[PDB]
Amino acid sequence: SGFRKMAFPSGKVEGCMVQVTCGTTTLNGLWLDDVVYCPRHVICTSEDMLNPNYEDLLIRKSNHNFLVQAGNVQLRVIGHSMQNCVLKLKVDTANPKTPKYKFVRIQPGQTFSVLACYNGSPSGVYQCAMRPNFTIKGSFLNGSCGSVGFNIDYDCVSFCYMHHMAFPTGVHAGTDLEGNFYGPFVDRQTAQAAGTDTTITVNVLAWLYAAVINGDRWFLNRFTTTLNDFNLVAMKYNYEPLTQDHVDILGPLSAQTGIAVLDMCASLKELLQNGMNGRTILGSALLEDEFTPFDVVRQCSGVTFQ
Amino acid sequence: SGFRKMAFPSGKVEGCMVQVTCGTTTLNGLWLDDVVYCPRHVICTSEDMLNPNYEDLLIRKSNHNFLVQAGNVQLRVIGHSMQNCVLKLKVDTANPKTPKYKFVRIQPGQTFSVLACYNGSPSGVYQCAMRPNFTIKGSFLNGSCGSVGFNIDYDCVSFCYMHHMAFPTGVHAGTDLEGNFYGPFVDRQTAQAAGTDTTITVNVLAWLYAAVINGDRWFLNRFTTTLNDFNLVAMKYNYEPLTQDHVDILGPLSAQTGIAVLDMCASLKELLQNGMNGRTILGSALLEDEFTPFDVVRQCSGVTFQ
Known part of the structure; x- marks a missing residue:
């Protein structure tokens, strides 16, 4: 009896969240096995974001420019590639707490839980839906970038969303875990229109x-x-x-x-x-x-x- | 930007939930160190609940009448006492995943997160408030009894609520973790009136x-x-x-x-x-x-x- 907007239990995702620092920027990353996933705009200054050439910016970065921190223990970066709009920081220590997981790209109208994080630390969890215009109406402050959305199928965690951008309008946009945005958005600091929203x-x-x-x-x-x-x-x-x-x-x-x-x-x-x-x-x-x-x-x- | 009804991350509570069985009844219990906490009406049949004499019912129960299950591993009961409306099942194995915790009795108008469970397994998490009439408007099905409410103060988990009863009205009632009901309610299957509710x-x-x-x-x-x-x-x-x-x-x-x-x-x-x-x-x-x-x-x- 009763009905509540219910989120999935977050335990299996908590042990996967790390803090990623490059230059002055710090956001959240997802540490599965020995790969850390994070928004590629961690390599940008506030100035770069106006018009970033990610290839050229990434070229001036070496493995030791990235500080990955999983609690009180620093991780070691051995390799970096850019898959679409996500950075894959290959590290040495595999995550012992790595759950049975899965990367999935959801369709509009489906729901998932978001584990909102700051500086690699879990702050709260809520449930939300992917709107028909491929935005979400979340709760995200500066440096919640990298926070992830997920469903749980019995024992398997299905990761479906990574937060990238907040728009002047109050709406939020992000990618799947392969780095493809949902919607017609790009990771640059410019005016971008979402579609008309419709009710599901x-x-x-x-x-x-x-x-x-x-x-x-x-x-x-x-x-x-x-x-x-x-x-x-x-x-x-x-x-x-x-x-x-x-x-x-x-x-x-x-x-x-x-x-x-x-x-x-x-x-x-x-x-x-x-x-x-x-x-x-x-x-x-x-x-x-x-x-x-x-x-x-x-x-x-x-x-x-x- | 944005605003959402946010729950606390549930990881530290998940590793504390066990399944408790006595006779035909099965509900959830909270396994901290070597004590399991659960509603005392786990010892009642559906018939007993109309008019239970808990002292007499508890007397016909011995330690081996209680099946505590923490996942795929059965626990061993060494002692049982009744503290107000909760049963304390002292067990042999202390919970290795026991967090820094605290028992607190909250005041009306305060909020907490509920980890809704069935058969000792986490189902979902949501945020709710203790109404001025000491009910909560939750989401609880049969055998969600024993589910717990909690806040998190940095590293310390403050347990404040344990679900006991669902009323015909759709509202839910429970105790603190010392076994004292919030409100004028009793754990028996009878008509019970909550106060007029007021807005906080x-x-x-x-x-x-x-x-x-x-x-x-x-x-x-x-x-x-x-x-x-x-x-x-x-x-x-x-x-x-x-x-x-x-x-x-x-x-x-x-x-x-x-x-x-x-x-x-x-x-x-x-x-x-x-x-x-x-x-x-x-x-x-x-x-x-x-x-x-x-x-x-x-x-x-x-x-x-x-």
Whole structure:
């Protein structure tokens, strides 16, 4: 009973966070086996960031220009390469606390947990979603660069995000762990536009099912509707159009509650047009789109990990 | 930049969670050194819970009736006592992963992180507040009993909460780690009323300061007001009255932003009377009271831990 924006337990990621220093810049790095991963803009001064030529900047750097610190013990850099927008600092000591891990590139609308770090030390953990415009709305201060996002599949940690940039708009951008940005962003200090943001409709429907599982049922109505007519209302309010793959994903939520996806949509349709009228659902005065269908099943069944 | 309901990193607590089984019942326990802590109602059947005489039930139990499991390794019970509403199962193996810890009993309005567990395995982590009526609005399924709440002071883990009961109302109740319930609750399966809930006014003001730190300033007005007149408006809307200790706690938030507490109150006063008019603050359509002033300073300065 109850429903909370829940993060994954962070223990397996904590033992992987190191502090990386090059010149005057210090940010966080991810120490798996004997490779440290960190944003390549650790090699830039505040002046370089306006127009960095990363190849030329990297050339004037040698292995002993990088101070990697894992707690009270300094690491030794044996080799450096640049994979897209991440620096791989090959080190000598492999991380004994290296978990079974995996690098994955997530799709918009999926959720993950962020372990926010400063100077290589864990500060806090929260759950967030990759927006349809490939930003995230995080909580990141200066020198939280290098902090990582992750999911947990039983015993395997899936790393999916590394924080790189904060934009004047309040939004945050980063890469996968191979160094490819999510979205059309580049790691330089210049004005960059994100797309129009849209609401993740499949997630909203998973949250309405969570509400029904928890005894909020007032939004339930008698109408039904069609996918095609719903999508016409949704596209008016900047909601992601629903496809059949979406209806199927919500299958188990439908079977455990005996309410048809299309019936849930008809409730939603009404909620977009008529509004909330000052009521709430699961404590909120707005429709929430940061829970995936799998997030809801996990929290309403008690899935555990290593 | 940005603001998120942030939990503490859970690594140090994960290595302390064990599974406790007695008869048919299985819940979570906290394994510090060579003592396991768990709800005493692990010794009850579903029938016993209606009217348990814990002393008599405990008498028919011997050390070998308790199966404590820490992963794939069974623990050995050497002694059991009942401290208030917690069972202390003294075991032989001390926990090697025992952190520097502390038992503390928190006051209403303070916040902590909950590590939700099932069968002794971490499932997720979230942040919550102790309501003024000594409940919490958590996310707990059957057999999440024994899950613990905690804060982190640099390297010391302060344990402050253990989950015991879920009430028909959707609210949750538990004890400190010495076994004293928060609130007027008892561990028996009967109807129990919580008090009227009130909004934690000092927390709300810390969140408005967080909003100003993040560029939301529309609620800022020109009026001021007095503590006494504000408290008269607040007591109308079921808000906790403000005292001078509260104004002082918000001192650093006031100095870093150059806005007087009483000026912030005058904004709040207006917000309670005139309403939100469909605007939002830090993304929310309602006033939030689950951030303490210290929570805001931690997230707006980058405080780190071991």
